[PDB]
Design a protein around this ligand. Structure first.
Ligand SMILES: Cc1cc2nc3c(=O)[nH]c(=O)nc-3n(C[C@H](O)[C@H](O)[C@H](O)COP(=O)(O)OP(=O)(O)OC[C@H]3O[C@@H](n4cnc5c(N)ncnc54)[C@H](O)[C@@H]3O)c2cc1C
Ligand SMILES: Cc1cc2nc3c(=O)[nH]c(=O)nc-3n(C[C@H](O)[C@H](O)[C@H](O)COP(=O)(O)OP(=O)(O)OC[C@H]3O[C@@H](n4cnc5c(N)ncnc54)[C@H](O)[C@@H]3O)c2cc1C
Lengths: 484, 484
């Protein structure tokens, strides 16, 4: 009947997870992946955003920055290290790219081994059950499938201003940049913006972040501001309430010199600054517009680009499914895309009825001082259950590892948000400190089990470990008592 | 009626936690603490074992070792560091002792602020409600109290052999040692033994561990062996099935040279070795024998030295309570002592009925590769529920941070133990990897909430973080399938 049982459009986290699982049940599967280049020409291999141009390289460079601090710390612990150690950009990129290459290859082998056809072509619906794939050299091929999975992801957004596409870079370009960016302006206050600002600073570069309004929209703002205070105290410059209106090249190079003109958000005040590199981290746009969805009848939100979907990841067209960042009002993270792909395959081809649970999905922002969160922000808890029913227990802590280097006391911060109407249920968990993700993972699991403050209090701490602060939280915001 | 409401004997974790909490309810409290010196003359200030001679200095030196690794790792991330960096023992100790001193002081002030009398004297019961306290210069004073709390801790045990007390050190001396130990023999396979062996090796010293039988008695033996394999692969020498029968001084010094004669455990074979320093980490003895318990009627286990106690920490004498490592068949960790002390004070003086929950208390062994555990060992699970009802999910993992340095793949290991007769309840949690304690803490809370495998599988991972390996465990030991 059809060429394939399933055709997956997009070879990112979600698509590949779906492919691997579907093939496990003997189904004929094809993955189409194609990385349309950056304005400046940057391309990469199989695996999608996370592998090539997201989580993996980002965390690796965050580690380069952390190791910078390790070198400093080591002195007081007795290691005889030269007072200032210099860092080499090109060496770091070679090592990162080398790793990304092995993952690119890893996936290509993985799909071959599981009998999944991988086609490096750009997919585009032409009609019911039919898709056209255009390869790099321009050749077209038409394929049919019983079902389709849109796993097409997003790409970085540009400001609609002169000079942006020609002289600025995005996260897409940064992680393979063939030269050290030098003095950098990061435009935006998304997690990607602050993560990159942070590690570029940790490697010793002069970094400025230009923000429109608030830091980390979507996240608990009390933590957001704490992250910002920390970055500002550790070198990073902030320009608040400004957006660039023009970027112009003073001199080309590697890096060259650029002038950025920015306008105030609440007045006609204009400022100028010159930078070596200008990074645009102001959000991402869904890749749902240029894939022929009209030819097949799939409905999307025309304003936001996102695809509405059932709690089973089904679009309005029964045989077409969508997963990943593309989805309307879900969670835009790699492991969510993976779980969604795995579970869809099992529902479709293995008789399972288990759905992807998008509630209380944990995250971590890898800022210089890491931020891990799970559940409701304080604001959202108050909105949902009422100020009077929310008790917020909090405390500062000082990692033992920081005492000998003698730095950053009363900076790491722990808070939980509890619902008094529901047995002091822990509806929100937030930590600012080292290894925030390692700390947050298990408390994410405790939320799935309906963790209560009585239960958390009864759990014994591990000593001396940062996470133990959560075992003995006794001071509430409402009490007004000090936590220094 | 009595001089004090409460007299606490011993100013360790537990005692001080009890004192601080009791004083908060306006009760008249005295703490007696006295550190009887090491055979070699080592003494220290207030705070007990943890603060002076346990978790705090131990983790700090563990960090000195970890930072050694960080210096090596940093090269491939692009930092231009000299190929071998040397380490200075004396500077490390100065920094550690400096921190311990601030904690010593911290407590001294804390007790002053909360109106708690601190007496640096050795406590000893003389009769009902009465105790004699002998200070350093030898002067005695008699005090009475309505109740008493024995929080007397333990001290390192020696082998009954010639030369042990005169020439060998214990954990007590190691953390203030005024010279670099040089070539070291660690005798024992307790967590203290392996932790110290590990960090002494991590600072570049030549370390040998001499073991009687198994590593880490009490802990999951599969994990124990993996920790040993890792230590052996990273420099540490192991002599198995030997115990020292004699230690003699070849030459005195700082360090000197010592000859250790050891005998096989299953034969008459004898081996000799020379070391600069010999550390005895073969366990600890309760300080319950020389404190006058006979004069007051408190029953102890005469074989083991431990004090039997109710689930409310009450001894057979109603007005006398005990907490901490001293207790019979409980859990010998700082945070357990603290929780027990806090909760006892609250039961006694604030109308609480909450008891200390000694079930599924988490621990972390700070070996070069860290081991975090909560709940049942695999062996103990099988013994309790039966082999056929236990499913063990496991996986290796590779910290992203180690990929660029290009080291130690298939070494970190995660397993959970599930009870099939009880909804695949996670009755055991085990992780071997970096920041094990940070990873384990929240899963400990999950176990308090009765975490289930269905629930764990429904929790989404944080990417790329080590802990996320627990989100997707699908391979069982019973299946026989490979996990490389
Ligand atoms: C800087 C940065 C940091 C991040 N950090 C984290 C983090 O720390 N933790 C975390 O969990 N997530 C992180 N992410 C988010 C994560 O990258 C995404 O959520 C994840 O990649 C989503 O998977 P996906 O399959 O939906 O999309 P993608 O992985 O991006 O896959 C989409 C793929 O499909 C291809 N494609 C698009 N259209 C077509 C077409 N028409 N035909 C064929 N192929 C097509 C694209 O080229 C792309 O390769 C980060 C992202 C960025 C940018
Ligand atoms: C090498 C080592 C590593 C350790 N690592 C960890 C770890 O990583 N995590 C963890 O949780 N625990 C660790 N511990 C164990 C932890 O330190 C103990 O569980 C904790 O100190 C228990 O405190 P306690 O209140 O029972 O007694 P202690 O802390 O030992 O205090 C007893 C105090 O009372 C004094 N005393 C004794 N007799 C008298 C008397 N007659 N009169 C007055 N004072 C007296 C003692 O001198 C001492 O100061 C470690 C211990 C060691 C030895």
């Amino acid at each position: 009947s059809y060429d394939y049982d399933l055709i997956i459009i997009g070879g990112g986290s979600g698509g590949l997870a779906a492919a691997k699982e579907a093939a496990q049940y003997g189904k004929k599967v094809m993955v189409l992946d194609f990385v349309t280049p950056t304005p400046l020409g940057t391309r990469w291999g199989l695996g999608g955003t996370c592998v090539n141009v997201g989580c993996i390289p980002k965390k690796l460079m965050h580690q380069a920055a952390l190791l910078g601090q390790a070198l400093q710390d080591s002195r007081n612990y007795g290691w005889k290290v030269e007072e200032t150690v210099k860092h080499d950009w090109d060496r770091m990129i070679e090592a990162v790219q080398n790793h990304i290459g092995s993952l690119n290859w890893g996936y290509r082998v993985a799909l071959r081994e599981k009998k999944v056809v991988y086609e490096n072509a750009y997919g585009q619906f032409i009609g019911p059950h039919r898709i056209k794939a255009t390869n790099n050299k321009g050749k077209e091929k038409i394929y049919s499938a019983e079902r389709f999975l849109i796993a097409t992801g997003e790409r970085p957004r540009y400001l609609g201003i002169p000079g942006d596409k020609e002289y600025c870079i995005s996260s897409d370009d940064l992680f393979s940049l063939p030269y050290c960016p030098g003095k950098t302006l990061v435009v935006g206050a998304s997690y990607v913006a602050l993560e990159c600002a942070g590690f570029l600073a940790g490697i010793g570069l002069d970094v400025t972040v230009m923000v429109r309004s608030i830091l980390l929209r979507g996240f608990d703002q009390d933590m957001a501001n704490k992250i910002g205070e920390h970055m500002e105290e550790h070198g990073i410059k902030f320009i608040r309430q400004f957006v660039p209106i023009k970027v112009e090249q003073i001199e080309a190079g590697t890096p060259g010199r650029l002038r950025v003109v920015a306008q105030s958000t609440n007045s006609e005040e204009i400022i100028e600054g010159e930078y070596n590199t200008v990074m645009l981290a102001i959000g991402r746009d869904a890749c749902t517009r240029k894939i022929g969805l009209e030819t097949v009848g799939v409905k999307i939100n025309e304003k936001t680009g996102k695809i509405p979907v059932t709690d089973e990841e089904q679009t309005n067209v029964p045989y077409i499914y969508a997963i990943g960042d593309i989805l309307e009002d879900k969670v835009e993270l790699t492991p969510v895309a993976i779980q969604a792909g795995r579970l869809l395959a099992q529902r479709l081809y293995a008789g399972s009825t288990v759905k992807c649970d998008y509630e209380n999905v944990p995250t971590t922002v890898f800022t210089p001082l890491e931020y891990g969160a799970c559940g409701l922000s304080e604001e959202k808890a108050v909105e949902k259950f009422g100020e009077e029913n929310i008790e917020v227990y909090h405390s500062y802590f000082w990692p033992l590892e920081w005492t000998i280097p003698s730095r950053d006391n009363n900076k790491c911060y722990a808070k939980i948000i509890c619902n008094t109407k529901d047995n002091e249920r822990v509806v929100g968990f937030h930590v600012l400190g080292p290894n925030a993700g390692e700390v947050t993972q298990g408390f994410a699991a405790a939320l799935k089990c309906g963790l209560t403050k009585k239960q958390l209090d009864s759990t014994i701490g591990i000593h001396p470990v940062c996470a133990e602060v959560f075992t003995t939280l006794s001071v509430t915001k409402r009490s007004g008592a000090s936590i220094l």
